[PDB]
Amino acid sequence: MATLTAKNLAKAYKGRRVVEDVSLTVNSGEIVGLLGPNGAGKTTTFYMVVGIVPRDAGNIIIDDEDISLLPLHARARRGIGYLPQEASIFRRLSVYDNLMAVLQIRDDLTSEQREDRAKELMEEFHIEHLRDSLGQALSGGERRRVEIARALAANPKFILLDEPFAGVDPISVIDIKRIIEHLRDSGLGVLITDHNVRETLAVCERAYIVSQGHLIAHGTPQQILEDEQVKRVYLGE
Amino acid sequence: ATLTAKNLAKAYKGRRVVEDVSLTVNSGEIVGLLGPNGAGKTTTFYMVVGIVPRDAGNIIIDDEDISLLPLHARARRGIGYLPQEASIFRRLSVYDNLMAVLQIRDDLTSEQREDRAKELMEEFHIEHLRDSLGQALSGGERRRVEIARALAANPKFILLDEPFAGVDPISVIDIKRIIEHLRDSGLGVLITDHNVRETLAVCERAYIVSQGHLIAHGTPQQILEDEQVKRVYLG
Amino acid sequence: IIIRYLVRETLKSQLAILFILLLIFFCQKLVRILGAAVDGDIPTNLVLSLLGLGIPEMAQLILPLSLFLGLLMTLGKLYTESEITVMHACGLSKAVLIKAAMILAVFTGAVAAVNVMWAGPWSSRHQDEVLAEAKANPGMAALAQGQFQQASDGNAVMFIESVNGNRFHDVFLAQSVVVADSGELSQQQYVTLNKGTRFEGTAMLRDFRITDFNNYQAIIGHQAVSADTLWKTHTDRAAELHWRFTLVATVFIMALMVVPLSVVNPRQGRVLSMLPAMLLYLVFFLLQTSIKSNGGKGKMDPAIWMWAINLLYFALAVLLNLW
Amino acid sequence: VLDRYIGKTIFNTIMMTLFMLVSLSGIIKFVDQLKKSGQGSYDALGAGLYTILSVPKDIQIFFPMAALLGALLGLGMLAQRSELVVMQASGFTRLQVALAVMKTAIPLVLLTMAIGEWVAPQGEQMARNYRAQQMYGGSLLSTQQGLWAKDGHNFVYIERVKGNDELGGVSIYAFNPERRLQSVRYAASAKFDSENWRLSQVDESDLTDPKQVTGSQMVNLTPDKLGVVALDPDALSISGLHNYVKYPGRYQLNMWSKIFQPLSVAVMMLMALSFIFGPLRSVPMGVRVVTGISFGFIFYVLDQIFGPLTLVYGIPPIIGALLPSASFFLISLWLMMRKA
Ligand SMILES: [Pt+2]
Ligand SMILES: [Pt+2]
């Protein structure tokens, strides 16, 4: 039931206005997309919502509390989850080890309840057979489910996902799109910024589209495809 | 002209990235080598290019064998490898970048070669970028300089590695039109890009390989309806 | 327990680059020992033993550098793999890697302490020695061969032009001269020179000694000895313990300084981002070596510029960490 | 058009590395200058061993290092930008690339011999001759040291040598064909006049026979500046070393170790190709620079360590210089004959 809202957001690198006046909203248990042309709006405005790229104008709110000050550091404590595109699995750390070593960081859980949450995360994502196996010794889909389960071991809502559709294999995207909807089912927010609109708008409830810096489109994907000005700069069906 | 490949195979650490693949591409006919990630599609393309050495393969042009000949030899014949990224010669002018390739061409006379540079400029609409270097070029205007520069090597076959590399749907139609422009001339293009929707939007025929072996071949409609690829690739 | 992962990586790198740095330093130490073997006219028997004599002297720079660069490489390589930015994406503190660095900095700071209280003065004891039985007593191992042999202070100077040690020439010695033809030498030690002439006529009126072809000996081989301000209850201070304790202080300063110098720049240039972080260490160590000049040890005490820049640099070490 | 592009890209990065490496030793050969400052100068000797001593840094040390790291990193950026595969996918040979890298070699080795034989001992000697504000040492200066000699089979000692061409002391031991003293000469100042060394206040104490104790008080091939070698530096011209070679071999190494410098610069460039065509496998700037910085030191070791290490057997300097610098090329030809 928590809410993640960005108001009057803007940024400029050295002189060039990367992103101008733009505002967005994402509530718990849904899929919200952030698309647009290359570099123009998307990805650059996404890391401001994540907390990496600094804020120049506006404010970011979580659970009706201010976070525009808070960087990538302690944003994850209330409800911020981040999954980068790049293979960020812990190399010389076993599946059970890297999951628990980041779960024991969260003090709001019992010493043996962390083991009970680990074996629960072993069944929810089916990683039980990999418990002992070391990191980076897993396949694309295998590493993917470890990254999601590990990042969730802090109870965060609004799972911000950078380019979740990297390995563009039309068979592989179906299961990745299905677990994204499972995060929606568990009542957690889902933010996506992937290039491929055909698989993002296929899972999205409402997606924001940002061009040149200023917000131009929002709502159901059917309203986006039907929109004339979004065809003028991004799709053109 | 034609370009053939017969019983192509390569092994890494015993993994065997390719196990007996055979594909042909004719002058005018634009084929597409597709398939899953690392399944074969990737290495098969570079084996045909000449980067990856064949372990059991056979690379033939129209009739002339090249499976033993390297990249710099195949290029002088009529092969045109185009990488996914820039490589437009940053510290070189567009005209000089075009002329540097024409320098190698011995079939063109001292003036006739300078004439092809002017010819490619007006062809790929880059005459406005004559004295300009190459350090900064828009996605559309950069790619047409690369193809022009590649064409300066007198090609028969043009192997386009991932031509839709992070290109927005508004710009894919322009990049797709270059392939359709080259198709109009006696060139046989070979695409290998991940966005199947756009690769099968241009290609007449398409070869699809899994675990190293060819499984699907034909027109886009013949692939889409095929039971094997609908479970291992298409979904 | 993510700290355990961080320290496992630094042990894999620091204790590997330490082996590599030993070799680079070994080579430069072998250059100067080879240099003294020709220009300085020092024997060949103590060449390899002097190489080992300088290993605790070498460790002064390799130990604070290995923990610095080991941490620079690991944090940098884990930063690129996105493990460092994903450690922070799933809660955690920037202090996690400061904690990891400082928890493995005590491991190295203890070895630097052994290299200061025990290994530091042991080398100084054998460096005052330079092996007296070989330096003060030059024998067959000394071998002049086609060139001079300056000894004591300007006066003693031998000059030979021999075949192997059977047929010598010139001799000279000076210490006012002595020139001999044939000659031999065999240690236990006597210089059995055949044909020759002696001299000691300083003035026209002053005496002059002479000789001829006899087997002279002069059985000489006097094994010379070592001759032939520290703690102080009160806050004495300042006399080289300003440096002797600073090389143990450097183990902890560079550990804190480089933590945010490896996770804020490699987004640009993977190895070019190491350059600003590395350059800092260089200037720091170039100035600490330079402060160790205005009256070194004992009587003349160095003014607090060594500890002044050690704090000016610690202020710099906390500065970036608060960002 | 492409020929000059390879030649430029590789050359400019060698000048980038030359100015990059020499500047670091330059900022270092200024802080050791403030370690030995407060004798008569600080800024005069500060720049007297910085702008003056900048020229003998290159040729003697950081020229083959820039002819490798710079040549390797020059192709390393071309390979990273993947312009190198385009040259090939155009029809430009692997050998055509090697031709242009070695085409820039010859005008660059020309540069090594020119400012290595002429401007290098110039900036070397003048930097040591400017060390007159700071006393205690050799050169035309003298404090608590006695200058020795040998004029064939003859011998000479000087108590103190001065810049005024006068020698405060002098003692020529004129020897006979059997090496028996015939003069114990002493001059307050034995000056030099065009061809002869002026013998002021002669004391030719003859001993032609053991009885012969003739004491003649009155008033040959004696070297003037040809004798002034200073604190025995070896770092001077190939010409200046050769004449001295006729006048026992530590000087002989350096006259060969100075003529290997032009070939080593070319060999390093041949090895940069042996590495850019050998270990290529899309390796990043990091791995390309670490072996670029290591192989420079590997080759510094074979010069500074294995070079003097030829004193052991007393193996001629040709084998001690023109061969450990050719061993570099022996790995180079091996790399190019294994992969290709
Ligand atoms: Pt076909
Ligand atoms: Pt680079």
Author numbering:
A (entry chain B): 1 to 237
B (entry chain A): 2 to 236
C (entry chain F): 2 to 176, 186 to 198, 203 to 242, 253 to 262, 264 to 348
D (entry chain G): 6 to 201, 204 to 226, 233 to 260, 268 to 360
Kindly provide excerpts from the paper associated with this entry.
The structure was determined to a resolution of 3.7 Ångström (Å) by the single-wavelength anomalous dispersion (SAD) using data sets collected at 1.0723 Å, and the sequence register was validated using sulfur anomalous data and selenomethionine anomalous data. Heavy-atom derivatives were obtained by soaking the crystals in potassium tetranitroplatinate (II) (see “Methods” section). LptF and LptG each contain six α-helical transmembrane segments, namely TM1-6-F and TM1-6-G, respectively, a periplasmic β-jellyroll domain, three periplasmic loops, and a pair of cytoplasmic turns. LptF and LptG form a hetero-dimeric cavity with a total of 12 TM segments and the two LptB copies form a homo-dimer in a “V” shape at the cytoplasmic face of the TMDs region. Overall, the dimension of the LptB2FG transporter is of ~86 Å in width and 128 Å in length. The two periplasmic β-jellyroll domains are shifted to one side of the transporter thus generating a periplasmic opening at the side of the TM5F-TM1G interface. The IM section of the internal cavity is very hydrophobic, while the section above the IM is highly positively charged. There is an extra electron density in the cavity that could not be assigned with any confidence. The highly conserved residues K34 (TM1G) and R136 (TM3G) of LptG are found at the upper cavity of the transporter and around this extra electron density. The periplasmic domains of LptF and LptG adopt β-jellyroll folds, which together comprise 10 β-strands in a manner that resembles the periplasmic β-jellyroll domain of LptC.
The asymmetric outer membrane (OM) comprises phospholipids in the inner leaflet and lipopolysaccharide (LPS) in the outer leaflet and is essential for Gram-negative bacteria. LptB hydrolyzes ATP to provide energy for LPS extraction and transport. To understand the structural basis of how ABC transporter LptB2FG extracts and transports LPS, we have solved the crystal structure of the LptB2FG complex from Klebsiella pneumoniae.
